[PDB]
Design a protein around this ligand. Structure first.
Ligand code: NA
Ligand code: NA
Lengths: 140, 140
């Protein structure tokens, strides 16, 4: 009962929006000593706390081998440490890693504030409402 | 004059929406003999027509060397051909390439129609309006 002309428009929009956001993200990260998958990894640790490599890889949709090499690079560069339970080894965001990602996120926020400056108060509030519903339906 | 709590929410939403869309895209492409950057390349050719490697690489935000290796793989697998002017060499979508991407896009559309089935007629129309404004402000 869904309208295919509209769904086709929406699919294209979402795709070109995500492609543009990806590139803005890239451009922003040129001024930071991390790579895009390190950004993703670090942001997961910031948002979730200590994660095992298994937990991290499930969040990033990577194989364990891939996630371990990534964690290894970040640990080598002092962005994260490996920490075993006192009671299992988890990855913990170090201060150096946290400082960088907080800075990247703030720059991402400023960048978006510039894109959004032509939305009115009402369009921003509706827009957020739409995204919140989209995100919720997409994550089950 | 922008509200930082809201902009922070919106930045996070857009990021987690794009991360979820990327993975849906990945899952869909597991049933197709192309890779994610071949999807992007092919979709640009479908949407724009014949492109030089320079034009294609500017669209994908890649270096020329990277784009040439990609075009080389796709040409080898019969997805695209190189075609010089009669009057400069352009990449042209072959029928084999077009058939595949049209199929991936249709599956992307069906997937989205499922995510959107709980939006009402009115929320879909507003939602599209928001995305259209977002996309337009993001592309200047
Ligand atoms: Na960088
Ligand atoms: Na594939």
């Amino acid at each position: 009962a869904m309208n295919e002309r509209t769904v086709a428009e929406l699919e294209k929009l979402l795709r070109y929006i995500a492609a543009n956001l990806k590139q803005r993200g890239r451009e922003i990260l040129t001024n930071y000593p991390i790579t895009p998958p390190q950004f993703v990894a670090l942001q997961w640790l910031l948002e979730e706390g200590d994660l095992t490599v298994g937990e991290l890889s499930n969040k990033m949709y990577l194989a364990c081998s891939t996630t371990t090499d990534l964690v290894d690079r970040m640990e080598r560069n002092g962005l994260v440490a490996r920490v075993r339970d006192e009671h299992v080894v988890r990855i913990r965001l170090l201060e150096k890693g946290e400082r960088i990602i907080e800075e990247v996120i703030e720059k991402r926020q400023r960048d978006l504030a510039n894109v959004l400056e032509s939305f009115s108060d009402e369009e921003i509030v509706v827009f957020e409402r739409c995204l919140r519903k989209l995100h919720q339906e997409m994550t089950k």
